Amino acid sequence: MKTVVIGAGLGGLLSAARLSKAGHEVEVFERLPITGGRFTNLSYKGFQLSSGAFHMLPNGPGGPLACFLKEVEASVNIVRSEMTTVRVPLKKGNPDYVKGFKDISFNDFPSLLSYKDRMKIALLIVSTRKNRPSGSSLQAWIKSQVSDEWLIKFADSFCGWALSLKSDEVPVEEVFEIIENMYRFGGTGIPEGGCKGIIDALETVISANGGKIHTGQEVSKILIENGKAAGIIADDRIHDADLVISNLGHAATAVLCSEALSKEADAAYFKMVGTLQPSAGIKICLAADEPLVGHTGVLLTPYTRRINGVNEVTQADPELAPPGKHLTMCHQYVAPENVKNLESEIEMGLEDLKEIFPGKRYEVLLIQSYHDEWPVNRAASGTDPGNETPFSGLYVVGDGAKGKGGIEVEGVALGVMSVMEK
Ligand SMILES: Cc1cc2nc3c(=O)[nH]c(=O)nc-3n(C[C@H](O)[C@H](O)[C@H](O)COP(=O)(O)OP(=O)(O)OC[C@H]3O[C@@H](n4cnc5c(N)ncnc54)[C@H](O)[C@@H]3O)c2cc1C
């Protein structure tokens, strides 16, 4: 078939790589000067920062993304991270890190509970695998099981870092599917070259399979003929297609289909699009003169105003920073109501840094905020719709149409796989 992909984000490039290998003519149209969307590198003062993602795969070398890459014969080294750690107050009862802190391994989170509560968690670790909690938020479920506030702080940190959500905003069943994927695929990892390593590898496969990628080209319309995708208009030129893959998310895709959509015949689709809620966050990048995390995993920070966790990917790939420097990146969840208040949100994160990393030698390199049309995810984890649209031959991929239960790009990969199978 003749196929076109709108947008060179990770979803679009995964699609292009698989479709070209599958024997289809593929052209990708990307509006920006470079490919990769929110998953590529940004050269900044000698550092390889990113356009979004923290240079990390949620399931490292074992998950749906890593698997997709092997399936299309993309070549890129993904290293498995060391176990994630968690920063907690020195004494139970301390509300923050002011009086000092200690670090525990992620898997030892129950160690801070009473014996009674620890044993309850041990049994739930067994029972929940096949008897999955459902029908409430994670926070509500935890509270029904254990009263110790530690688990809520820990859950909020995990949910903030991994999903850019609060634990009272994610369905418990989604969290248990995510947990099942940890067992299936393993922990985090870091691609050599950062995000761009993966982007470059996919571009190589696309090129080797006769696909073409066009940057600096904005798609302005999806052509529909008799309820069927028929092509696109990009930079005022018509391109025919039997298949259109949109990497823009449903909302933006709907706008491109505006002339063909019916508020009557497509009422369910309009309603769906109107419910989509993106997630928001702020990333603080530090130019560190010494290690702050000290390993290749995540440091979760549950006892802060805003910061949920931090990583240090130069532990895995030193080429992402100048000699004698580390790149340490922090994430904080931003609630939709506070997007209008980004300045004060940032201030709070900056205060957190002093308590997380007291007396350490670093400078704030860049602060980047994400929300709305360039968000953390186009659809909040646990809420993704499918990849289909009212029109045959038109599919949506990307983090506005993630496979259920995949964290971040693992979800993006699952979604692309679903479309490909269809
Ligand atoms: C701060 C932050 C940190 C993150 N950290 C991680 C992480 O650590 N691990 C992880 O797995 N994920 C992480 N993510 C999520 C990850 O970055 C995204 O899920 C992923 O990059 C989204 O990919 P996508 O397929 O949706 O495409 P997108 O990145 O949304 O790309 C869409 C592309 O379409 C182009 N486009 C838009 N309109 C048009 C048009 N009309 N014509 C042509 N092109 C168009 C855009 O320029 C863009 O390149 C993070 C996200 C954020 C915001």
TrEMBL record:
Keyword Cell cycle belongs to the record: no
GO molecular function: nucleotide binding; oxidoreductase activity
Location of the Amine oxidase domain: 10-411
Top-level division of the source organism's lineage: Archaea
Annotated FAD binding sites: 11, 30, 38, 54, 56, 219, 378, 399, 409
Gene3D superfamilies, sorted: 3.90.660.50, FAD/NAD(P)-binding domain (3.50.50.60)
Swiss-Prot/TrEMBL keywords: FAD, Flavoprotein, Nucleotide-binding
The keyword Lyase is assigned to this record: no
PANTHER family documented for this protein: PHYTOENE DESATURASE
Protein's UniProt name: Putative oxidoreductase
Organism of origin: Methanosarcina mazei (strain ATCC BAA-159 / DSM 3647 / Goe1 / Go1 / JCM 11833 / OCM 88)
